[PDB]
Amino acid sequence: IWAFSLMFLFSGRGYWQELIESIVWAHNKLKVAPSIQPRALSITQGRAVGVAHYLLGGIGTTWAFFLARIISV
Amino acid sequence: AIDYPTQLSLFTHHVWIGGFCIVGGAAHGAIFFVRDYNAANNYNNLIDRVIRHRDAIISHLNWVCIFLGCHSFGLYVHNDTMRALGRSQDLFSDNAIALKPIFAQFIQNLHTLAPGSTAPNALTTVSYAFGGDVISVGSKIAMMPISLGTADFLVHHIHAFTIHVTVLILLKGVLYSRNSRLIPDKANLGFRFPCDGPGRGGTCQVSAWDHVFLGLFWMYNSI
Amino acid sequence: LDGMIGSSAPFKNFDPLGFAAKADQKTLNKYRESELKHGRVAMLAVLGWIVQEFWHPLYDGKLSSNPLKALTEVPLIGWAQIFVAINVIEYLQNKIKELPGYRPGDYLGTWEWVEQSDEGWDSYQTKELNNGRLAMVAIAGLIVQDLITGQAALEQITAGNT
Amino acid sequence: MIYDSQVYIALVIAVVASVLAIRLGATLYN
Amino acid sequence: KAERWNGRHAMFGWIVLLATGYAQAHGLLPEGGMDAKEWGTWVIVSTTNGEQVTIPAARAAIAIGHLHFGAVGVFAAYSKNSVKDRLLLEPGEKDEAPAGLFPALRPGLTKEAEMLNGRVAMLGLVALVAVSAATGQDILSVIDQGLGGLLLK
Amino acid sequence: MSLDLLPSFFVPLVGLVLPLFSIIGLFLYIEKEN
Amino acid sequence: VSFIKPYRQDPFVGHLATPITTSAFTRAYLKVLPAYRPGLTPLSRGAEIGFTHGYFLIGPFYTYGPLRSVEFSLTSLAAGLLAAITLLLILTVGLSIYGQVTYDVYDNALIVKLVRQMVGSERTQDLPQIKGTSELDTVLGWQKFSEGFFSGGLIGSIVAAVGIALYSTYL
Amino acid sequence: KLKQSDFPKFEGSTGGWLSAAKNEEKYVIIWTSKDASLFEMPTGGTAKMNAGNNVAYFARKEQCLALGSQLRGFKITNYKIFRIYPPLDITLLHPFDGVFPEKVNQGRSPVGKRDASIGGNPNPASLKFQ
Amino acid sequence: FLISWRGYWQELIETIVWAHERTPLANLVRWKDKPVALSIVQARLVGLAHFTIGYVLTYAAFVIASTIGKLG
Amino acid sequence: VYKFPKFSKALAEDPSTRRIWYGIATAHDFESHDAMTESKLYQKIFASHFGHIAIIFLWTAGNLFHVAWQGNFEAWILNPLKVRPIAHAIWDPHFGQAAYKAFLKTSSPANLALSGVYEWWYTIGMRTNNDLYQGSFFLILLSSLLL
Amino acid sequence: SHTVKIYDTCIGCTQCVRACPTDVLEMVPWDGCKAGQIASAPRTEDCVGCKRCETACPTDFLSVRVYLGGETTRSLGLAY
Numbered sequence A: 001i002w003a004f005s006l007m008f009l010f011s012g013r014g015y016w017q018e019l020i021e022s023i024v025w026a027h028n029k030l031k032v033a034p035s036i037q038p039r040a041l042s043i044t045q046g047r048a049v050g051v052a053h054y055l056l057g058g059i060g061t062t063w064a065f066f067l068a069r070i071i072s073v
Numbered sequence B: 001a002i003d004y005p006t007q008l009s010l011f012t013h014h015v016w017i018g019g020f021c022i023v024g025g026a027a028h029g030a031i032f033f034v035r036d037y038n039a040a041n042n043y044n045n046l047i048d049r050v051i052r053h054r055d056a057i058i059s060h061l062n063w064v065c066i067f068l069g070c071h072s073f074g075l076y077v078h079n080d081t082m083r084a085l086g087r088s089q090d091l092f093s094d095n096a097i098a099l100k101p102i103f104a105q106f107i108q109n110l111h112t113l114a115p116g117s118t119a120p121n122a123l124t125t126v127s128y129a130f131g132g133d134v135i136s137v138g139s140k141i142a143m144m145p146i147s148l149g150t151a152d153f154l155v156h157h158i159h160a161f162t163i164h165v166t167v168l169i170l171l172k173g174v175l176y177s178r179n180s181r182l183i184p185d186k187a188n189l190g191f192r193f194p195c196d197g198p199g200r201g202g203t204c205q206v207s208a209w210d211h212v213f214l215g216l217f218w219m220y221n222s223i
Numbered sequence C: 001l002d003g004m005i006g007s008s009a010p011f012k013n014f015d016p017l018g019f020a021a022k023a024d025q026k027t028l029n030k031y032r033e034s035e036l037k038h039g040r041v042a043m044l045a046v047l048g049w050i051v052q053e054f055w056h057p058l059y060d061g062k063l064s065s066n067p068l069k070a071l072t073e074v075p076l077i078g079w080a081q082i083f084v085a086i087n088v089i090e091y092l093q094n095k096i097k098e099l100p101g102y103r104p105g106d107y108l109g110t111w112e113w114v115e116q117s118d119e120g121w122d123s124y125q126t127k128e129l130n131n132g133r134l135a136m137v138a139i140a141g142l143i144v145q146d147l148i149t150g151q152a153a154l155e156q157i158t159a160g161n162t
Numbered sequence D: 001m002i003y004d005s006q007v008y009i010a011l012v013i014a015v016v017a018s019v020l021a022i023r024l025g026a027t028l029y030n
Numbered sequence E: 001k002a003e004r005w006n007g008r009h010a011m012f013g014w015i016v017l018l019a020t021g022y023a024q025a026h027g028l029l030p031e032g033g034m035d036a037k038e039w040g041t042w043v044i045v046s047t048t049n050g051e052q053v054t055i056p057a058a059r060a061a062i063a064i065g066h067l068h069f070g071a072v073g074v075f076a077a078y079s080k081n082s083v084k085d086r087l088l089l090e091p092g093e094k095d096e097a098p099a100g101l102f103p104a105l106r107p108g109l110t111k112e113a114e115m116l117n118g119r120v121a122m123l124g125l126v127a128l129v130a131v132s133a134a135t136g137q138d139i140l141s142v143i144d145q146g147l148g149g150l151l152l153k
Numbered sequence F: 001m002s003l004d005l006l007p008s009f010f011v012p013l014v015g016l017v018l019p020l021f022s023i024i025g026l027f028l029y030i031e032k033e034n
Numbered sequence G: 001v002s003f004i005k006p007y008r009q010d011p012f013v014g015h016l017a018t019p020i021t022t023s024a025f026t027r028a029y030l031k032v033l034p035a036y037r038p039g040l041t042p043l044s045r046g047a048e049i050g051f052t053h054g055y056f057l058i059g060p061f062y063t064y065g066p067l068r069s070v071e072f073s074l075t076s077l078a079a080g081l082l083a084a085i086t087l088l089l090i091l092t093v094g095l096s097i098y099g100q101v102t103y104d105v106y107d108n109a110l111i112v113k114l115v116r117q118m119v120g121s122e123r124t125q126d127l128p129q130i131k132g133t134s135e136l137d138t139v140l141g142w143q144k145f146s147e148g149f150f151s152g153g154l155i156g157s158i159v160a161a162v163g164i165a166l167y168s169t170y171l
Numbered sequence H: 001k002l003k004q005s006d007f008p009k010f011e012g013s014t015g016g017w018l019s020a021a022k023n024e025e026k027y028v029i030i031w032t033s034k035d036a037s038l039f040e041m042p043t044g045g046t047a048k049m050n051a052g053n054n055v056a057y058f059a060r061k062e063q064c065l066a067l068g069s070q071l072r073g074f075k076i077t078n079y080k081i082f083r084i085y086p087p088l089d090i091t092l093l094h095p096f097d098g099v100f101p102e103k104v105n106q107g108r109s110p111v112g113k114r115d116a117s118i119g120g121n122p123n124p125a126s127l128k129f130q
Numbered sequence I: 001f002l003i004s005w006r007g008y009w010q011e012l013i014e015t016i017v018w019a020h021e022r023t024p025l026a027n028l029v030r031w032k033d034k035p036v037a038l039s040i041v042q043a044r045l046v047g048l049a050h051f052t053i054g055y056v057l058t059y060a061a062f063v064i065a066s067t068i069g070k071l072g
Numbered sequence J: 001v002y003k004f005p006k007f008s009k010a011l012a013e014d015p016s017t018r019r020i021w022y023g024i025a026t027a028h029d030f031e032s033h034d035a036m037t038e039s040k041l042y043q044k045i046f047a048s049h050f051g052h053i054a055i056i057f058l059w060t061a062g063n064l065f066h067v068a069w070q071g072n073f074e075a076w077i078l079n080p081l082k083v084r085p086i087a088h089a090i091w092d093p094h095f096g097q098a099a100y101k102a103f104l105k106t107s108s109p110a111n112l113a114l115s116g117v118y119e120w121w122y123t124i125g126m127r128t129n130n131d132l133y134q135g136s137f138f139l140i141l142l143s144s145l146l147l
Numbered sequence K: 001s002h003t004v005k006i007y008d009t010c011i012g013c014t015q016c017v018r019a020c021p022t023d024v025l026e027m028v029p030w031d032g033c034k035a036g037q038i039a040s041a042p043r044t045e046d047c048v049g050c051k052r053c054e055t056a057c058p059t060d061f062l063s064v065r066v067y068l069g070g071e072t073t074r075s076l077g078l079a080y
């Protein structure tokens, strides 16, 4: 999860929107494009997702490390 | 005290909750400044005077953060490179250049002497961490004097440095939430906005939210 | 004995011997400078006397807690540095004294900001002056008592040599 | 083990290659 | 300008080489090697089998003397407004005119005399290095041969 | 002068003097005017 | 009373008149420093600054260098002195290049008046503009300042080394 | 208290202009207000208008224009922004023809107008080495 | 350099600029180029360069040292 | 603040430090330089290619010389499975005595060679520290040719 | 300084002009749309590149386009 966060933290919205463009092209080619137009997460939401995943991954890694170490010994 | 998993988990959990809540307090201070702050109602009061010299505060906090980081972390790196170069007597260690936390040891001595001298109705010190006997329950140590040496000096200054940088990010977010030299009308863009544009060389993350984002990162580091 | 700051309730314009009734403004400025310097030095001296008596962390302990005895125990090369620092400070004060609008005891240059002084500013200046006077009397008493008895402040009080 | 003469002349030839390098560097302009 | 400065340095260095030969011959020029325990591992030259060959103490002393002279030079370089002859040319200043194949024969403490002597000293250093490289002896050995034996005596 | 003295002659020379002169030249060049 | 006011009655400057920026103590203390002391040529300012700076610079190098000694060692003192002198040389190089790239003036406090009076219709930045009227703000002034800094640094480092040796030997 | 009587009653902030607006350019905004309204400075905090002529100096055109946009909330419209070079070289900037740029005024010519949409732009490969 | 973007570093640099401009004994020294934060593309490049250099260095150290210390 | 990005007037007029940063990162984008033609582009690329090949040959010559001078190539020939190849000697003033002792190989502290040049040169028929020196000399000559 | 171009897809809705923070754009008479007005960019020397102008553009792919170019103390938004 911590490594997953870096996708949102390091990248930008334009690339994901333009990739969603081709995915939407495929869906339209198969007549399965949703009426609710799929858009990439906003810049602020991309940052929020990145920081939330970063915190969750780091805190969970420390959580598992601490708990296993201090329960074993 | 003899259930070490419980003690470790309780400490870590409560410190994490504290750090998150502090970052949230900074975030909502910034939100108040953006939304609920009225310039007319706060003429020449404390809030106004703080905004009027925000530059001085932020610049001196920047200098303090650089000083603390340089010192703490570079003493760590100096120790690392002296050890890697086979120069064990050039470290910032106890058997080397020693940085004794004398102020904290003085306080530790004052507490272990408190019962009968300054707390005359006490029978024992408040905590054995300040000094005293080793308290063991079922052959497991409950509490014991926590000695402070050069290793605790460095890590305490690391704590101070990380806390100062987190405060720097959050205070810069709160103070520059309404306006700046870059964006003189940042309050009109709201508390939560990505940028003002690629101009001015680039105006990413100028919000105040983007400061609660970076401050969350630095709080994670510190905690 | 003028509209000068420092007149308090118990004895307003306290000049029983008339030292100020004949002096000009320059002599009165000199008197105020001397009084303020004496008061500040005496406040520092009283605080140091007491704190040294019940706390002397420096010099690896030693430096007997009784003042007027540690006066002859400082390495005498630390005395020189204190003397030089006081001298440099007073050289800076002398340089301040020629700045325009200088006031007798004002080394912070409060005349730059304080035009048309308030009652709070005058009251605080009087507070500083009165505390300085009390500290002058206290330090004179401290030195005299330690000379005649040989015990320090908290030592003489603790034993009961009163 | 190479001699002092071997290293010295290699250093001298290296100097000549250096003067040729700045001439190429300056010819590729400021 | 560069030619004049290099000629001055070449003459002074002929003097320095004579002084070094005299010091080596007359029991000066300290003996042994530098103390690695005192001056770190940077003075260690090689370790053949369990012994550390260090930089000779004589080399260190000669380097210190050369450091004195080079420091004097660096001060004069960053003292342009107080020295009689500057190291570099001021913007506007124009380089003295080349002396040519043969500088004017003006004896005494003249620009031409110093110019000629600097050229002669630099040529002498070039010839000394060439002789040492071609024949294979030490520089001081070549100077000793070129003085008959009156230097290393 | 032996061959083993060349490291002690060259490493300080290169790694300290060359940075100094290179910094001087580069700073002078990039701070020029027209 | 209020002890913070706009600087020089200008509420639009990025500055304030606090009890630290514009206090009489600050005024006198900064006016006795070599950088602002009246009656000093730029060479004298540089010499005093270099003396003080070398004097306090030899300290950390000698005390905490790579060749320290809990007792007094001539090698430790020489190492600290050489390190301080080389650091002063680096600082002098920086001063020289800074002055080379910053100013183009040989006599200030006049050129400004000349171009404010006799017009400055030229390439500007030498006739017009000109930041600062101090003698330190000229090509000649900064060159002498750097020369003084360098010489005074050498002298002060040597003096501090002598003092350190005397203190370690006779005390 | 202040250098000029028309300055807003501002206590000064460490966010005003710097050495740049003494040797490159400074911007001054002038306006007349009916009331001594309390407004927020683009640089620091709260200042008080004068019931009459008001003059403020800033380091950027954007700061003056942000102040002017704030003034519109006070029903103030006559604000005018000038650029001052290192000497007293005053140039009127914002109400350039006396009419705000949002309102069409005769005597303005189109600058930077292309007589085609975006799709008519030339291919970059045909704009190589010019 | 990758997580923190510009805009947050321009205001901090402005504060540093004010601090340098308003301090005695350092007003004598002024920059010729106005210090500004790295551009967005430059910041991306610098973060990528740090990421790549650290990646390469740490893996080279690991592979070499592990092979040497494990296989004699 | 001028004359550094000689190839770009737009950058040379930048009053900020961005001019220095962008001057480095646009130095080799010849197609974007001011007053640019195709002939000059190809000629500059050609000369840069020559300088680059010269750099490569100088790097190889340096490897050869340092193996010949501070390596143990000749000793490695007689026992390739036990002798560890040496890349070059180390002279670092920051070393302690312990670091000197640990990095000490034969006569001076040195780095083991992980480039496999010993095996490559041994395979192609090199048996002497004078064969490597000849290669270094020839490669410096080739670098001079290319420059 | 940055480059700002206006295209005839302009509908003269003035949202670009009233969004410019540095007074770069202005409305000028025109005869290519119902409103009889088109945006102009006569003060691009003050253009900062914030692109607020084209965030307020309602036309399909914009009628005001900002091309970032050479930087200036005005275009970099430097108060120092």
Ligand code: CLA
Residues within 6 Å of the ligand: B061, B062, B063, B065, B066, B067, B068, B069, B070, B073, B074, B077, B165, B168, B169, B214, B215, B217, B218, I001, I003, I004, I012
């Ligand atoms: C290991 C990675 C790393 C490091 C070293 C830093 C370092 C720093 N960050 Mg941070 N940061 C990081 C990751 C890191 N960050 C990440 C991942 C994020 C994303 C959220 C951030 C976000 C962030 C923000 C938002 C802020 C910082 C700030 C700071 C600075 C605090 C002041 C200080 O200590 O300066 C001292 C410098 C150091 C301690 C670095 C090491 C220096 C060595 C030990 C000493 C000097 C070495 C010497 C000069 C080398 C010379 C030789 C060389 C020329 C060859 C400091 C430069 C704050 C700032 O601007 O500064 C006040 C700030 O506001 N950072």
Ligand code: CLA
Residues within 6 Å of the ligand: B070, B071, B072, B073, B074, B075, B077, B078, B081, B090, B091, G057, G060, G061, G064, G065, G066, G067, J094
């Ligand atoms: C901030 C972190 C830090 C600190 C404090 C030190 C400290 C030290 N290092 Mg070190 N080092 C560090 C990081 C640090 N290192 C890092 C990150 C690396 C790896 C790149 C190294 C690599 C390294 C090596 C390789 C060596 C050292 C050595 C040393 C020692 C001597 C250095 C010296 O000559 O001082 C020079 C000091 C000065 C010129 C003075 C600077 C400090 C002054 C006093 C500041 C004064 C401020 C003042 C109070 C302001 C108020 C003034 C008032 C009038 C208003 C010293 C103990 C050497 C050693 O062996 O020592 C044991 C050595 O060989 N270091």
Ligand code: CLA
Residues within 6 Å of the ligand: C040, C041, C043, C044, C045, C047, C048, C049, C051, C052, C055, C056, C057, C058, C059, C062, C063, C064, C065, C070, C071, C074, C078, C085, C089
């Ligand atoms: C007139 C003032 C004065 C004088 C002459 C002395 C003299 C002495 N003190 Mg002392 N002291 C003073 C005030 C003074 N004290 C005050 C006010 C305190 C309370 C903080 C102390 C606390 C104190 C302790 C805890 C100790 C001494 C000790 C000593 C002795 C050794 C010197 C030393 O280490 O000082 C140390 C002094 C300090 C740590 C505090 C000094 C702070 C100064 C007075 C305030 C700032 C002065 C400034 C430079 C000038 C003012 C600026 C402006 C007003 C113009 C020496 C006899 C030591 C000793 O051997 O005891 C027997 C010792 O351990 N002093």
Ligand code: CLA
Residues within 6 Å of the ligand: D010, D011, D012, D014, F006, F007, F008, F010, F011, F014, F015, J055, J058, J059, J060, J061, J062, J063, J065, J088, J089, J090, J091, J140
């Ligand atoms: C690119 C090839 C290359 C590389 C990376 C190195 C690397 C090194 N050499 Mg080296 N060397 C080389 C070629 C090379 N050498 C050649 C061809 C010769 C024969 C003349 C030497 C002769 C030589 C000696 C005699 C010594 C070193 C030493 C060293 C080490 C310290 C650096 C130093 O003092 O350089 C000094 C290098 C020279 C005086 C020769 C010049 C190097 C080549 C010809 C220049 C290559 C330039 C390169 C292509 C790009 C330059 C970039 C520049 C513009 C910034 C270091 C490991 C020292 C050592 O072993 O310390 C332990 C040492 O004493 N070298």
Ligand code: CLA
Residues within 6 Å of the ligand: E039, E040, E042, E070, E071, E074, F011, F012, F014, F015, F016, G065, G066, G067, G078, G079, G080, G082, G083, G085, G086, G089, J093, J094
């Ligand atoms: C190739 C690069 C290189 C080289 C060769 C050196 C070399 C050296 N470093 Mg160093 N260093 C470097 C890069 C380098 N550094 C970098 C990049 C950093 C930052 C990460 C450091 C950080 C560092 C620290 C923190 C310290 C060193 C120290 C040292 C010295 C080793 C300690 C010793 O025993 O000397 C003892 C030193 C002496 C006896 C005196 C040496 C003083 C200078 C160097 C002599 C120069 C003479 C010069 C020609 C004089 C010019 C004329 C002048 C008089 C006018 C040595 C001179 C240590 C040292 O000595 O500090 C000064 C030390 O504390 N270095």
Ligand SMILES: CCCCCCCC(=O)OCC(=C\C=C\C(C)=C\C=C\C=C(C)\C=C\C=C(/C)C=C=C1C(C)(C)C[C@H](OC(C)=O)C[C@@]1(C)O)/C=C/[C@@]12O[C@]1(C)C[C@@H](O)CC2(C)C
Residues within 6 Å of the ligand: E016, E019, E020, E023, E028, E029, E030, E060, E061, E062, E064, E065, E066, E068, E069, E072, E076, E082, E083, E084, E085
């Ligand atoms: C290298 C020598 C080889 C000898 C072999 C052994 C000796 C040795 O080892 O030496 C090294 C050594 C000492 C060397 C000392 C030296 C060279 C001092 C030189 C000082 C030069 C000075 C003052 C120059 C002044 C010039 C000026 C002012 C120049 C100038 C002018 C003027 C004159 C024209 C006037 C102009 O006027 C205007 C207009 O400005 C300005 C200017 C600039 O132009 C000690 C070595 C050891 O002590 C150590 C290290 C260890 C011990 O255990 C063993 C020994 C004793 C051997």
Ligand SMILES: CC(/C=C/C=C(C)/C=C/[C@@]12O[C@]1(C)C[C@@H](O)CC2(C)C)=C\C=C\C=C(C)\C=C\C=C(C)\C=C\[C@@]12O[C@]1(C)C[C@@H](O)CC2(C)C
Residues within 6 Å of the ligand: E006, E009, E010, E011, E012, E013, E014, E016, E017, E122, E123, E125, E126
């Ligand atoms: C500088 C020089 C000597 C300098 C010596 C100095 C400073 C002295 C240093 C010392 O004092 C110290 C410091 C310390 C002492 O302990 C050691 C010494 C050493 C004693 C020799 C130059 C010697 C320089 C020489 C010999 C130059 C020869 C150049 C020739 C032949 C050029 C020919 C051409 O220019 C033409 C004619 C036409 C062109 O188109 C083509 C070509 C071919 C390029």
Ligand SMILES: CC(/C=C/C=C(C)/C=C/[C@@]12O[C@]1(C)C[C@@H](O)CC2(C)C)=C\C=C\C=C(C)\C=C\C=C(C)\C=C\[C@@]12O[C@]1(C)C[C@@H](O)CC2(C)C
Residues within 6 Å of the ligand: E010, E011, E012, E014, E015, E117, E118, E120, E121, E122, E123, E124, E125, E127
């Ligand atoms: C000038 C010189 C030295 C000058 C020294 C001076 C000024 C010293 C001045 C002093 O102030 C100092 C500095 C320091 C003071 O404490 C001492 C004094 C004394 C006060 C040496 C020249 C030294 C000059 C030398 C050694 C010349 C050697 C020339 C050779 C070998 C020529 C060979 C040829 O002529 C043939 C044989 C055939 C030809 O066809 C081909 C060639 C090759 C040209």
Ligand SMILES: CC1=C(C/C=C(\C)CCC[C@H](C)CCC[C@H](C)CCCC(C)C)C(=O)c2ccccc2C1=O
Residues within 6 Å of the ligand: A007, A008, A009, A011, A012, A013, A016, A039, A040, A041, A042, A043, A045, A046, A047
């Ligand atoms: C991948 C990515 C996207 C695309 C991401 C999208 C469209 C999110 C898609 C989420 C799906 C549709 C729903 C979530 C599905 C998960 C399986 C549910 C979460 C798991 C639960 C256990 C919580 C961005 O929009 C973006 C924006 C800015 C910076 C970086 C990025 C970025 O990295």
